[PDB]
Amino acid sequence: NPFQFYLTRVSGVKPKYNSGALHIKDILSPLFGTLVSSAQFNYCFDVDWLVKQYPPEFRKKPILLVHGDKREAKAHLHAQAKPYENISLCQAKLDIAFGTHHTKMMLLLYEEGLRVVIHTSNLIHADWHQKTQGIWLSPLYPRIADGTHKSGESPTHFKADLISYLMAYNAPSLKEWIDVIHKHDLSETNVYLIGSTPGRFQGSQKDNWGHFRLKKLLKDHASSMPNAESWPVVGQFSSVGSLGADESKWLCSEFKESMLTLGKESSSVPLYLIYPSVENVRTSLEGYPAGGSLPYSIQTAEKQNWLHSYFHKWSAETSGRSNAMPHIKTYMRPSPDFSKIAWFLVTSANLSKAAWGALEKNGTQLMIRSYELGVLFLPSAFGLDSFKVKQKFFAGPMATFPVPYDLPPELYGSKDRPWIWNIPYVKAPDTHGNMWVP
């Protein structure tokens, strides 16, 4: 496979469903490279646990934690890291209210080169235990010889784009990592970076981030096909923001409009949203506690009941993960019979304006509250017109893309409800014998 898209290991499924999966200990193993330094971008950290995931011989190498915590949360994280003299911290500025540092990324500097890992898991035991999470593994990027002048750039512009994402933090510890990236050859990269950073973007900068970044890449690097209006959009996520009083406010007016872009020229496109039902969570490996990582509040949900008619159950027989609740986020463009896809995105971004951006100032400014990061797989970047959908995620041409859940998505039944994490469920017990009482 050329895609280097992986799922995390899930405890309790049969070995055939973990054979091609990766645990964090696999990613950090010496087999992946001889570690010199690393940066861990994330939201939530268990520092004691995190250091134990590095190989013993690498546990004193410098580690930078990139986070968004403030005030007492920030103090708690520093207290976690204080016992480890090799750990430094970078507080990402969040100068727009209600923003989050969501991005999940590892920068791994080795004696042999550099690796970038863009993934969906928090750095805590539970996120790697029994959840469906996604990982993109970069190639081992070699160092450019001292005195040699080459760009090290890929046809997808990944090197400049990753540097641009890091520059937006305006942080000295990340300028060090920018200088590291400058010194390496990233030309083999076949994915496009799609990032979000906090700000208000107008003019040229509008296309740099969020859903306008996606739109720009689809305009420039995908082509429209006949009957494109019949190719659905699929979005799949672990959290939902306030989207407005009806679908015209944001979901179908700018979000869907960006996602249905194909090619340069100028809607009844079906929109499928995949988000665990209450029954999905109850019967999951974790049981109701899985819902602690699906943070859709009743205050948000009761303002947008129109949204739930778009919702489809989580189902992942293809990867043996129907009972491993999703914390991965993915977006893609399948054909009308779901046998091909025009593109696939794995990202930190949930279904929210904070993550993707919302237009302001009479449509001239894109406002983003949060840091997000994902990678886009486009057929053109692999010399293809479309991707065939892989029939079984872990089965055996290699030009078929490993979609990790079942197609077509299945609409909620009349008795199903979206998982809402801060109301009780006491009708039926979960797989551990328990109810849910927030």
Ligand SMILES: Nc1ccc(C(=O)O)c(C(=O)O)c1
């Ligand atoms: N405050 C958060 C809300 C939602 C999520 C999610 O991704 O589901 C996260 C996260 O895991 O980073 C953090």
